[PDB]
Paper text:
[name] ([name]) {also known as TRAF and TNF receptor-associated gene ([name]) or ETS1-associated protein II (EAPII) } is a 5′-tyrosyl DNA phosphodiesterase that can remove the covalently-attached abortive complexes generated by DNA topoisomerase II (TOP2) when it is unable to complete its normal catalytic cycle. Fortunately, this type of DNA lesion is efficiently repaired, in part though the action of [name], which hydrolyses the phosphotyrosyl bond in a magnesium cofactor-dependent reaction, leaving ligatable 5′-phosphate moieties.
We were successful in obtaining diffracting crystals of 148 in complex with m2hTDP2CAT, determining the structure at a resolution of 1.7 Å. In this instance, we also supplemented the purification buffers with manganese chloride (iso-structural with magnesium, but readily discernible in electron density maps) in order to more fully define any interaction of the inhibitors with the metal-dependent catalytic centre of the enzyme. In the 148 complex, the side chains of Arg276 and Asp277 make the same set of interactions with the carbonyl and nitrogen groups of the pyrimido-dione ring, as with 163. Electron density maps also clearly showed the position of a tartrate molecule (picked up from the crystallization mother liquor), which is hydrogen-bonded to the side chain of Ser239, as well as an extensive series of water-mediated interactions with several amino acid residues surrounding the catalytic centre. Moreover, its position marks a potentially useful ‘molecular interaction path’ that could be utilized in future iterations of [name] inhibitor compounds.
Author numbering: 123 to 370
Write the structure that this text describes.
Amino acid sequence: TISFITWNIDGLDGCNLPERARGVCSCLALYSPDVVFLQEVIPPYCAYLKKRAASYTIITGNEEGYFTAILLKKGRVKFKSQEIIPFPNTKMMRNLLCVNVSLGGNEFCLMTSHLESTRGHSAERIRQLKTVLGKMQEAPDSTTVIFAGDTNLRDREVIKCGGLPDNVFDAWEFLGKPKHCQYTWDTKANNNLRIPAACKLRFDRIFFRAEEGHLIPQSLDLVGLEKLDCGRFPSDHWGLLCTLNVVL
Ligand SMILES: N#Cc1ccc2cc3c(=O)[nH]c(=O)nc-3n(-c3ccc(O)cc3)c2c1
Ligand SMILES: [Mn+2]
C-alpha cells in the first residue's frame, strides 16, 4: 500500500500564508500520508514545513521563484535517488521532479510537476504532458510509477497529446469518475480567489503505471475543504488524497 496527497498550495498568495500553511500541516498530521507532492511552494513556505511537518523529508529540485517538492515520511519512505527532467521550452520555470524511493518493501518512482499554466500555453503544456508520460513508461519494469501533480489540463488536451498510453491510468478515471472529487479548482465552492466567474476544472491529477495485478487505487478524496479561521481555505486548489493497494 501507499497513501499520498498532491496539492498546489498557492504559495504565491501572500495573504494569510502562515495560517494557510498551518492549515496544510494540520491536514498532513490528520491524514498522515506516506508522501506529499506539493506545487507552488515558495521559500518561506518551506521554512514552515520544516517546523510544522518536521517528520517529512522535503525533496526539492530547483527553487527559483516558486517550485514543486516531494515530502517523504521519515521512517516509512527511504530516499534512493532523484532525477530532474527539464522542460526546455517552459516559460514558467516548470520541470519534472522524480524521486526513487522504497516503501513497504516495494520500489517506487514518484513524480511531480506543475505543468505550464493558462489556456494560452496549451501547446507547451501538451508537449510537457507527453514528456511526463514517456518518462513514466521508461521506468524499470519492477518499479511502481506514480505521477501526481498540477497538470493544468482541460478540455481535450490529453487526447491531443496522443492519449494516455495503454499502460498508464488516471486514478480518477480508473475509479469510475466519482463526482465527489471531480473538480480540484472550483471557484464557486472555493473563495480564495476573489473573482466573479464560475469555473470548475480538474487540474490536479494522478497517473499510475500498470504492473498487472499489483497496486491499484482504492480511494480518492478531496482535502483542504475546511475553512480556516480567516474565512478562506488553505489554497485555491483542493488537494487530492489517494491510496493504492494490491488486490490479488
Ligand atoms: N479569472 C478567471 C477565470 C474564469 C473562468 C474560467 C473558466 C475556464 C474554463 O471554463 N475553461 C478553461 O480551460 N479555463 C478557464 N479559466 C482559466 C483558469 C485558469 C487559467 O490560468 C486560465 C483560464 C477560467 C478563468
Ligand atoms: Mn496559485
